[PDB]
Amino acid sequence: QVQLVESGGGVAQPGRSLRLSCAASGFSFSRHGMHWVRQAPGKGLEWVAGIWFDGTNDYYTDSVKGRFTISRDNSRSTLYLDINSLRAEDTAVYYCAREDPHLLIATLDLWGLGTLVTVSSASTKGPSVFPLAPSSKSTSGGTAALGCLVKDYFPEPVTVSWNSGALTSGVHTFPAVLQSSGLYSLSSVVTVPSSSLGTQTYICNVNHKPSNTKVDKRVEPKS
Amino acid sequence: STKPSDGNST
Amino acid sequence: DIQVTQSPSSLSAFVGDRVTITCRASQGLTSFINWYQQKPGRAPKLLISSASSLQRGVPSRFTASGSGTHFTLTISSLQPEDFATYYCQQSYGTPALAFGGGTKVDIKRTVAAPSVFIFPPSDEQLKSGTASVVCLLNNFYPREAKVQWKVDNALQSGNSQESVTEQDSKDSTYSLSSTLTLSKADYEKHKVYACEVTHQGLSSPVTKSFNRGE
């Protein structure tokens, strides 16, 4: 495999330091300039740092100079990114990438799968799960929506199933959003025949592995 | 000459 | 400062259409340009360099024309694996690299208005001190849609967050949730909670509402 493999990501607190590594295999690492490119959740790619094949001439985007150091150990075919003081805005997947030696525009022709860095002061916490109850205006012979609100957990991810996976048609589990509290929230919804409300039982199965939390929440029409 | 980005030859 | 901007931000096309993305970039080192492709949850990959001249594994239906500060990428006869986000990229003598903001190419299909649903907060959550009010826009196309929260007909701002699914693999629609967050105390000050929706599939706005307690 001709590849790059990043490691060292995880949750870190603002103000702390961090070191990312990138292991190269399958090509002559010491012949290539190398780069770090990051991608904040839901945002575009941002180049952050570059270095010559010989480990000299490390250079940075303005917002990270003096905080980030890119470096390499050619004897171990490894690239490093040291961050000496983390900021909330450093949350991103960090990719290492190889530069083509033969093109005069700096061109990144090989990428790793990336490593996620989550900068946060939040502690690990399992979610509270609340029903999104099907409306009483739900019309006989039509379709109703119901769901679960999975609120205030950290870190990602949660998983959600309905009726232990028996219900998959019509399920939409939304991407989590980061709340102003620094905790995540998401909803899972499903549309069902309105005739099944009075008859069938609906339960969302929520699992949050980082806190070893499991919740099965019944969703019923409300009183 | 030398590429400013990677130090390789142009 | 250095700016690299792409237009449009998003576009839809049918399998077989012809697509063109524009890149406007602060003048760089070489007047060439690079394009990358990224699919959701996946790493970016190099698509094409306007500096290249060998053939490469590029399936050739991609063309990168331009020079200076103005470039385009064209996809003749779009294929299913081409639906993705595309980034242009320039390099500079500082040195530095700079990526454009990206252009998402999604799957065109017939316009479908959202099915709208509003959910009141649970009594369980209220006892904990917070009211989440949730508005669901289900199975719509195109992506562009506006949710407006109204509380006793007063338009809300700054107190909601939205999330949207990826385009559905089977019917090419989107779904969207908007969540209004109030304290228990603020929630209890008002009666009528309403989500009002506009979308290309709707010729006038759709409102779903409930009265607190009913």
Short mmCIF file of C-alpha atoms in Angstrom, two decimals:
data_model
loop_
_atom_site.label_atom_id
_atom_site.label_comp_id
_atom_site.label_asym_id
_atom_site.label_seq_id
_atom_site.Cartn_x
_atom_site.Cartn_y
_atom_site.Cartn_z
CA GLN A 1 0.00 0.00 0.00
CA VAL A 2 1.27 3.47 -0.98
CA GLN A 3 -0.22 5.49 1.86
CA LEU A 4 -0.03 8.01 4.69
CA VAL A 5 -1.47 7.23 8.14
CA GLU A 6 -2.16 10.01 10.65
CA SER A 7 -2.40 9.46 14.40
CA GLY A 8 -2.50 11.47 17.61
CA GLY A 9 -5.97 12.95 17.38
CA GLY A 10 -8.46 12.93 20.21
CA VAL A 11 -10.06 15.29 22.68
CA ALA A 12 -7.70 17.93 24.10
CA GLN A 13 -8.30 20.94 26.29
CA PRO A 14 -7.72 24.50 25.05
CA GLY A 15 -4.27 25.71 26.01
CA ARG A 16 -2.75 22.21 26.06
CA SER A 17 -0.20 20.90 23.56
CA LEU A 18 -0.58 18.09 21.04
CA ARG A 19 1.59 16.09 18.63
CA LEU A 20 0.25 14.49 15.47
CA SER A 21 2.16 11.85 13.54
CA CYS A 22 1.89 10.70 9.92
CA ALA A 23 3.46 7.35 8.90
CA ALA A 24 4.41 7.03 5.22
CA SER A 25 4.68 3.68 3.42
CA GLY A 26 5.32 2.52 -0.12
CA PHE A 27 7.27 5.44 -1.60
CA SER A 28 10.51 7.36 -0.99
CA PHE A 29 9.35 9.69 1.78
CA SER A 30 12.60 11.70 1.82
CA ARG A 31 12.11 12.82 -1.81
CA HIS A 32 8.83 14.67 -1.13
CA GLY A 33 7.74 17.92 0.38
CA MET A 34 4.97 17.25 2.89
CA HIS A 35 1.99 19.23 4.17
CA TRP A 36 -0.74 19.28 6.79
CA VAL A 37 -4.26 20.28 5.68
CA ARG A 38 -7.19 20.41 8.09
CA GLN A 39 -10.96 20.46 7.80
CA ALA A 40 -13.12 21.90 10.56
CA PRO A 41 -16.50 20.13 11.03
CA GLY A 42 -18.77 21.12 8.17
CA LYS A 43 -16.19 23.42 6.56
CA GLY A 44 -13.82 23.37 3.61
CA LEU A 45 -10.19 22.38 3.42
CA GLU A 46 -7.60 24.70 5.00
CA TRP A 47 -3.89 24.29 4.28
CA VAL A 48 -1.86 24.88 7.45
CA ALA A 49 1.79 23.85 7.08
CA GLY A 50 4.44 22.68 4.64
CA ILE A 51 8.02 21.48 4.77
CA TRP A 52 10.80 20.69 2.31
CA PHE A 53 11.93 17.14 1.57
CA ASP A 54 15.00 17.62 3.79
CA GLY A 55 13.16 18.95 6.87
CA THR A 56 14.17 22.59 6.34
CA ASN A 57 12.00 25.56 5.35
CA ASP A 58 8.91 24.82 7.41
CA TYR A 59 6.20 27.38 6.67
CA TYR A 60 2.68 28.01 7.93
CA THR A 61 -0.57 29.81 7.39
CA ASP A 62 -0.59 33.06 9.36
CA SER A 63 -3.13 31.95 11.97
CA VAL A 64 -0.97 29.05 13.20
CA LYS A 65 2.58 30.42 12.91
CA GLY A 66 4.26 30.40 16.31
CA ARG A 67 1.83 27.75 17.58
CA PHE A 68 2.32 24.92 15.03
CA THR A 69 5.57 23.21 14.10
CA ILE A 70 5.75 20.81 11.19
CA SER A 71 8.77 18.52 11.20
CA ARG A 72 9.88 15.19 9.83
CA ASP A 73 12.06 12.20 10.63
CA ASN A 74 13.18 10.85 7.26
CA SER A 75 14.93 7.87 8.85
CA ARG A 76 11.49 6.76 10.12
CA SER A 77 9.41 8.02 7.13
CA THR A 78 7.27 10.04 9.55
CA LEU A 79 5.86 13.57 9.50
CA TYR A 80 4.91 15.47 12.65
CA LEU A 81 2.74 18.42 13.58
CA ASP A 82 3.34 19.90 17.03
CA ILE A 83 0.76 22.33 18.42
CA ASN A 84 2.09 24.13 21.48
CA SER A 85 -1.18 25.77 22.63
CA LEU A 86 -4.53 24.56 21.32
CA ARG A 87 -7.48 26.83 20.54
CA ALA A 88 -11.13 25.94 20.05
CA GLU A 89 -10.72 26.91 16.36
CA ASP A 90 -8.16 24.11 15.94
CA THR A 91 -10.93 21.48 16.01
CA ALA A 92 -10.66 19.66 12.67
CA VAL A 93 -9.70 16.47 10.89
CA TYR A 94 -5.98 16.84 10.17
CA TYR A 95 -4.70 15.30 6.92
CA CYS A 96 -1.07 14.79 6.02
CA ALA A 97 -0.43 15.10 2.31
CA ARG A 98 2.44 14.49 -0.10
CA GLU A 99 3.62 17.12 -2.59
CA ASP A 100 4.43 16.18 -6.19
CA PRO A 101 8.14 16.98 -6.74
CA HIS A 102 7.81 17.59 -10.50
CA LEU A 103 5.00 20.18 -10.71
CA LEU A 104 5.84 23.81 -9.99
CA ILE A 105 2.46 24.54 -8.46
CA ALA A 106 2.44 22.85 -5.06
CA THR A 107 0.23 19.82 -5.74
CA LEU A 108 -0.96 17.32 -3.10
CA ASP A 109 -1.18 13.94 -4.82
CA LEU A 110 -1.47 11.56 -1.82
CA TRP A 111 -3.59 11.99 1.32
CA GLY A 112 -4.07 10.03 4.52
CA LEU A 113 -7.47 9.22 5.97
CA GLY A 114 -6.97 11.92 8.62
CA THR A 115 -7.04 12.18 12.39
CA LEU A 116 -9.71 14.10 14.31
CA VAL A 117 -8.64 16.71 16.85
CA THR A 118 -11.45 17.92 19.13
CA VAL A 119 -10.51 20.92 21.29
CA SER A 120 -13.00 21.28 24.13
CA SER A 121 -13.31 21.85 27.86
CA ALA A 122 -16.27 19.44 28.05
CA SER A 123 -16.20 16.28 30.13
CA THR A 124 -17.48 12.95 28.83
CA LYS A 125 -21.25 12.85 29.39
CA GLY A 126 -24.05 10.58 28.21
CA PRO A 127 -27.16 12.06 26.56
CA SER A 128 -30.61 12.77 27.86
CA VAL A 129 -33.22 11.33 25.49
CA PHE A 130 -36.61 12.99 25.07
CA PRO A 131 -39.61 12.00 22.92
CA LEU A 132 -40.65 13.89 19.81
CA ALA A 133 -44.27 12.87 20.20
CA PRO A 134 -46.52 12.29 17.16
CA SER A 135 -49.00 15.14 16.79
CA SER A 136 -52.61 14.79 17.93
CA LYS A 137 -53.56 16.45 14.64
CA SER A 138 -52.09 13.37 12.93
CA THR A 139 -54.74 12.41 10.37
CA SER A 140 -56.21 8.91 10.17
CA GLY A 141 -55.28 7.19 6.92
CA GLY A 142 -52.22 9.43 6.52
CA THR A 143 -48.63 9.66 7.72
CA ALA A 144 -47.29 10.80 11.10
CA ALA A 145 -43.81 11.82 12.22
CA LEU A 146 -42.23 10.98 15.56
CA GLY A 147 -38.72 10.81 16.95
CA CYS A 148 -36.23 11.21 19.78
CA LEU A 149 -34.16 14.22 20.79
CA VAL A 150 -30.71 13.05 21.95
CA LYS A 151 -29.35 16.02 23.87
CA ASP A 152 -26.25 17.20 25.73
CA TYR A 153 -23.66 14.48 25.16
CA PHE A 154 -19.90 14.50 24.72
CA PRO A 155 -17.97 13.47 22.77
CA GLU A 156 -19.34 12.18 19.47
CA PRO A 157 -20.74 9.76 18.48
CA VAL A 158 -24.13 8.37 19.42
CA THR A 159 -26.01 5.71 17.50
CA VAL A 160 -29.78 5.49 17.23
CA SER A 161 -31.97 2.59 16.14
CA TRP A 162 -35.74 2.24 16.16
CA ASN A 163 -37.48 -0.82 17.63
CA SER A 164 -34.12 -2.62 17.88
CA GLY A 165 -33.57 -2.06 14.18
CA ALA A 166 -36.91 -3.50 13.03
CA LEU A 167 -37.90 -0.02 11.81
CA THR A 168 -35.54 1.36 9.16
CA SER A 169 -37.78 2.64 6.37
CA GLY A 170 -38.41 6.36 6.81
CA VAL A 171 -35.76 6.88 9.49
CA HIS A 172 -33.64 10.03 9.35
CA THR A 173 -30.97 10.43 12.04
CA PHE A 174 -29.54 13.90 11.71
CA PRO A 175 -25.91 14.94 12.04
CA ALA A 176 -25.11 16.18 15.51
CA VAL A 177 -24.86 19.92 16.13
CA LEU A 178 -22.46 21.47 18.64
CA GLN A 179 -24.41 23.58 21.13
CA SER A 180 -23.19 26.80 22.76
CA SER A 181 -22.58 24.67 25.89
CA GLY A 182 -19.97 22.63 24.02
CA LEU A 183 -22.20 19.53 24.20
CA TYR A 184 -23.68 17.84 21.15
CA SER A 185 -27.32 17.30 20.30
CA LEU A 186 -29.15 15.47 17.56
CA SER A 187 -32.60 14.22 16.64
CA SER A 188 -33.70 10.99 15.01
CA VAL A 189 -37.10 10.97 13.29
CA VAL A 190 -39.24 8.48 11.43
CA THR A 191 -42.45 8.72 9.44
CA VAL A 192 -45.04 5.98 9.96
CA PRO A 193 -48.65 5.29 8.97
CA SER A 194 -50.97 7.24 11.26
CA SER A 195 -52.95 4.02 11.76
CA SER A 196 -49.97 2.43 13.51
CA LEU A 197 -49.93 5.05 16.28
CA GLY A 198 -52.73 3.56 18.36
CA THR A 199 -51.42 0.04 17.71
CA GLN A 200 -47.63 -0.24 17.21
CA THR A 201 -45.02 0.62 19.84
CA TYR A 202 -42.13 2.96 18.96
CA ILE A 203 -38.87 2.97 20.93
CA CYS A 204 -35.59 4.66 20.00
CA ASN A 205 -32.48 2.77 21.06
CA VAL A 206 -29.70 5.25 21.84
CA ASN A 207 -26.12 4.13 22.49
CA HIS A 208 -23.28 6.42 23.62
CA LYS A 209 -20.17 4.26 23.83
CA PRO A 210 -17.76 6.90 25.29
CA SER A 211 -19.88 7.14 28.45
CA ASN A 212 -21.12 3.51 28.34
CA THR A 213 -24.66 4.93 28.19
CA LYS A 214 -27.59 3.02 26.67
CA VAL A 215 -31.16 4.35 26.72
CA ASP A 216 -34.35 2.89 25.21
CA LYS A 217 -36.97 5.66 25.07
CA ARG A 218 -40.64 4.97 24.36
CA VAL A 219 -42.26 7.56 22.06
CA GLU A 220 -46.02 7.75 22.51
CA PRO A 221 -48.80 10.17 21.61
CA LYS A 222 -49.02 12.53 24.55
CA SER A 223 -51.94 12.88 26.98
CA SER B 1 16.42 26.76 -9.50
CA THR B 2 14.44 25.50 -6.50
CA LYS B 3 10.73 25.24 -5.74
CA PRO B 4 9.89 27.40 -2.69
CA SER B 5 7.27 24.88 -1.51
CA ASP B 6 9.26 21.63 -1.32
CA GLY B 7 12.88 22.57 -2.07
CA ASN B 8 13.00 20.29 -5.10
CA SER B 9 14.55 21.20 -8.43
CA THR B 10 12.44 23.07 -10.98
CA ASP C 1 -5.19 38.75 2.17
CA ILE C 2 -5.00 35.80 -0.21
CA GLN C 3 -8.51 34.84 -1.31
CA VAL C 4 -9.64 31.84 -3.35
CA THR C 5 -13.33 31.82 -4.19
CA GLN C 6 -15.45 29.34 -6.13
CA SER C 7 -18.77 29.82 -7.92
CA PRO C 8 -21.38 28.60 -7.66
CA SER C 9 -21.30 27.27 -4.08
CA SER C 10 -23.55 24.40 -5.16
CA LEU C 11 -25.11 23.03 -8.32
CA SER C 12 -27.35 20.14 -9.29
CA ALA C 13 -27.07 17.98 -12.38
CA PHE C 14 -28.43 14.81 -13.92
CA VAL C 15 -26.23 11.82 -14.67
CA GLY C 16 -25.03 12.84 -18.13
CA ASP C 17 -25.15 16.63 -17.73
CA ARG C 18 -22.27 19.02 -18.34
CA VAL C 19 -20.99 20.96 -15.33
CA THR C 20 -18.66 23.96 -14.95
CA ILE C 21 -17.12 25.27 -11.71
CA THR C 22 -15.38 28.66 -11.48
CA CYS C 23 -12.34 29.46 -9.34
CA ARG C 24 -11.22 33.02 -8.58
CA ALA C 25 -7.85 33.07 -6.82
CA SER C 26 -5.39 35.78 -5.77
CA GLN C 27 -2.55 35.67 -8.30
CA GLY C 28 -0.27 32.78 -7.40
CA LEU C 29 3.24 31.56 -8.14
CA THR C 30 2.59 29.78 -11.47
CA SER C 31 -0.84 30.70 -12.96
CA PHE C 32 -1.71 26.99 -12.89
CA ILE C 33 -4.46 25.58 -10.67
CA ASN C 34 -5.32 22.32 -8.91
CA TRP C 35 -8.70 20.66 -8.39
CA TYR C 36 -9.56 18.12 -5.70
CA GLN C 37 -12.61 15.95 -5.12
CA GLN C 38 -14.06 14.92 -1.76
CA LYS C 39 -17.05 12.76 -0.91
CA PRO C 40 -18.89 12.90 2.42
CA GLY C 41 -16.99 11.29 5.28
CA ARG C 42 -14.02 10.60 2.98
CA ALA C 43 -10.60 12.09 2.49
CA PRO C 44 -9.96 14.50 -0.39
CA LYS C 45 -8.15 13.25 -3.46
CA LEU C 46 -6.30 15.05 -6.23
CA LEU C 47 -8.53 15.21 -9.31
CA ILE C 48 -6.53 17.17 -11.90
CA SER C 49 -3.73 19.74 -12.10
CA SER C 50 -3.81 22.34 -14.87
CA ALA C 51 0.00 22.02 -14.76
CA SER C 52 0.02 18.35 -15.80
CA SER C 53 0.76 17.07 -19.30
CA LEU C 54 1.19 13.28 -18.95
CA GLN C 55 -2.04 11.31 -19.22
CA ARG C 56 -2.48 9.97 -15.65
CA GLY C 57 -5.39 7.83 -14.50
CA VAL C 58 -7.68 10.84 -14.97
CA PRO C 59 -10.76 9.59 -16.89
CA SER C 60 -10.29 12.73 -19.09
CA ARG C 61 -13.91 13.94 -18.90
CA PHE C 62 -12.47 16.60 -16.55
CA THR C 63 -10.98 19.80 -17.99
CA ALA C 64 -9.19 22.61 -16.13
CA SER C 65 -8.99 25.74 -18.29
CA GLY C 66 -7.76 29.19 -17.31
CA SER C 67 -4.76 31.19 -16.16
CA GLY C 68 -3.97 34.12 -13.85
CA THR C 69 -6.75 34.65 -11.31
CA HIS C 70 -9.63 32.93 -13.20
CA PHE C 71 -10.08 29.16 -13.75
CA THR C 72 -12.79 26.61 -14.50
CA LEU C 73 -13.31 22.86 -14.16
CA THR C 74 -15.74 21.14 -16.54
CA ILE C 75 -17.26 17.66 -16.29
CA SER C 76 -18.59 16.51 -19.65
CA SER C 77 -21.14 13.70 -19.23
CA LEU C 78 -21.41 13.60 -15.46
CA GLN C 79 -21.32 10.08 -14.01
CA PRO C 80 -22.73 8.78 -10.69
CA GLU C 81 -19.36 8.67 -8.96
CA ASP C 82 -18.85 12.37 -9.75
CA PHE C 83 -21.40 13.70 -7.25
CA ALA C 84 -19.13 15.20 -4.60
CA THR C 85 -17.55 18.46 -3.44
CA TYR C 86 -14.79 20.04 -5.53
CA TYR C 87 -12.00 22.31 -4.30
CA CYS C 88 -9.63 24.42 -6.36
CA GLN C 89 -6.20 25.20 -4.94
CA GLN C 90 -3.44 27.71 -5.69
CA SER C 91 0.16 27.93 -4.47
CA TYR C 92 2.21 31.03 -3.68
CA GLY C 93 5.79 32.21 -3.34
CA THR C 94 5.64 33.02 0.40
CA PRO C 95 5.38 29.93 0.25
CA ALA C 96 1.77 28.97 0.96
CA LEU C 97 -1.12 26.94 -0.40
CA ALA C 98 -4.73 28.13 -0.48
CA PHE C 99 -7.93 26.16 -1.08
CA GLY C 100 -11.16 27.53 -2.46
CA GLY C 101 -14.29 27.16 -0.38
CA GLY C 102 -15.60 24.23 -2.40
CA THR C 103 -18.48 23.51 -4.78
CA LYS C 104 -20.95 20.73 -4.03
CA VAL C 105 -22.41 18.91 -7.04
CA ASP C 106 -25.57 17.05 -6.03
CA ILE C 107 -28.09 14.92 -7.89
CA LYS C 108 -30.86 16.76 -9.70
CA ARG C 109 -34.40 15.38 -9.54
CA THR C 110 -37.95 16.70 -9.67
CA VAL C 111 -38.78 19.40 -7.13
CA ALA C 112 -40.41 18.05 -3.97
CA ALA C 113 -41.84 20.26 -1.21
CA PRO C 114 -40.99 19.28 2.38
CA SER C 115 -43.47 17.64 4.69
CA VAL C 116 -43.33 19.84 7.77
CA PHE C 117 -43.84 18.72 11.37
CA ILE C 118 -43.49 20.62 14.66
CA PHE C 119 -42.81 18.94 18.02
CA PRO C 120 -43.34 20.57 21.44
CA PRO C 121 -40.84 19.95 24.24
CA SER C 122 -41.48 17.00 26.52
CA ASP C 123 -42.69 17.54 30.07
CA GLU C 124 -39.62 15.51 31.10
CA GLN C 125 -37.25 18.05 29.54
CA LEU C 126 -39.15 21.03 30.95
CA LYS C 127 -38.60 19.85 34.53
CA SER C 128 -34.85 19.88 33.82
CA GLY C 129 -35.10 23.60 32.93
CA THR C 130 -35.00 23.72 29.11
CA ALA C 131 -37.45 23.64 26.20
CA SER C 132 -36.34 22.27 22.84
CA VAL C 133 -38.90 22.89 20.10
CA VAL C 134 -38.21 20.88 16.95
CA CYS C 135 -39.30 21.51 13.38
CA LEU C 136 -38.79 18.77 10.79
CA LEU C 137 -38.70 19.33 7.03
CA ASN C 138 -38.90 15.86 5.51
CA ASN C 139 -37.91 14.52 2.06
CA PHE C 140 -37.55 17.69 -0.01
CA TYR C 141 -35.57 18.76 -3.06
CA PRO C 142 -33.68 21.05 -3.78
CA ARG C 143 -31.52 21.59 -0.71
CA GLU C 144 -32.30 25.29 -0.34
CA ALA C 145 -34.95 25.88 2.33
CA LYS C 146 -35.70 28.50 4.97
CA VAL C 147 -37.15 27.89 8.44
CA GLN C 148 -38.48 30.87 10.39
CA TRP C 149 -39.42 30.42 14.05
CA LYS C 150 -42.27 32.57 15.34
CA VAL C 151 -43.23 32.82 19.02
CA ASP C 152 -46.60 34.50 19.60
CA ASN C 153 -46.01 35.66 16.00
CA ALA C 154 -42.71 37.34 16.96
CA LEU C 155 -39.92 36.33 14.58
CA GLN C 156 -37.05 34.61 16.39
CA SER C 157 -33.35 34.89 15.69
CA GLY C 158 -30.19 33.62 17.33
CA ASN C 159 -31.87 30.84 19.34
CA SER C 160 -32.09 27.97 16.83
CA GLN C 161 -29.76 25.49 15.12
CA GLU C 162 -30.29 23.46 11.93
CA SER C 163 -29.04 20.09 10.75
CA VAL C 164 -29.48 18.50 7.32
CA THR C 165 -29.06 14.93 6.10
CA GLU C 166 -26.91 13.95 3.17
CA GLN C 167 -28.81 13.47 -0.05
CA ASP C 168 -30.77 10.24 0.23
CA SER C 169 -29.30 7.29 -1.67
CA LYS C 170 -32.69 6.04 -2.89
CA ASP C 171 -34.84 9.11 -3.64
CA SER C 172 -32.26 11.95 -3.81
CA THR C 173 -34.13 14.12 -1.27
CA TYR C 174 -32.94 15.96 1.83
CA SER C 175 -34.37 16.27 5.31
CA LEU C 176 -33.77 19.07 7.78
CA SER C 177 -34.33 19.70 11.47
CA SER C 178 -34.47 23.10 13.14
CA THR C 179 -34.35 23.21 16.94
CA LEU C 180 -35.49 26.25 18.94
CA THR C 181 -33.97 26.29 22.44
CA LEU C 182 -35.54 28.33 25.26
CA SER C 183 -35.29 28.24 29.01
CA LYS C 184 -38.28 26.75 30.80
CA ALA C 185 -39.09 30.26 32.02
CA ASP C 186 -39.01 31.86 28.56
CA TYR C 187 -40.97 28.97 27.07
CA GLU C 188 -43.76 29.42 29.63
CA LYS C 189 -44.15 33.12 28.76
CA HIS C 190 -45.73 32.41 25.37
CA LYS C 191 -48.59 30.46 23.84
CA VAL C 192 -48.17 29.95 20.09
CA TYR C 193 -45.06 28.23 18.73
CA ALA C 194 -44.76 28.15 14.95
CA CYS C 195 -42.31 26.96 12.31
CA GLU C 196 -42.75 28.70 8.93
CA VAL C 197 -41.09 27.19 5.85
CA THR C 198 -40.28 28.40 2.34
CA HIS C 199 -38.95 26.19 -0.46
CA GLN C 200 -39.08 26.06 -4.26
CA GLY C 201 -41.80 23.38 -4.04
CA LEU C 202 -44.09 25.78 -2.12
CA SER C 203 -45.73 28.75 -3.82
CA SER C 204 -46.48 30.33 -0.43
CA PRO C 205 -45.07 29.64 3.03
CA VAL C 206 -46.16 26.62 5.04
CA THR C 207 -46.66 27.03 8.80
CA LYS C 208 -46.93 24.31 11.43
CA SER C 209 -47.80 25.42 14.95
CA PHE C 210 -48.99 24.39 18.38
CA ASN C 211 -50.37 26.12 21.46
CA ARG C 212 -48.41 25.48 24.65
CA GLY C 213 -50.37 23.07 26.83
CA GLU C 214 -52.74 21.91 24.08
#
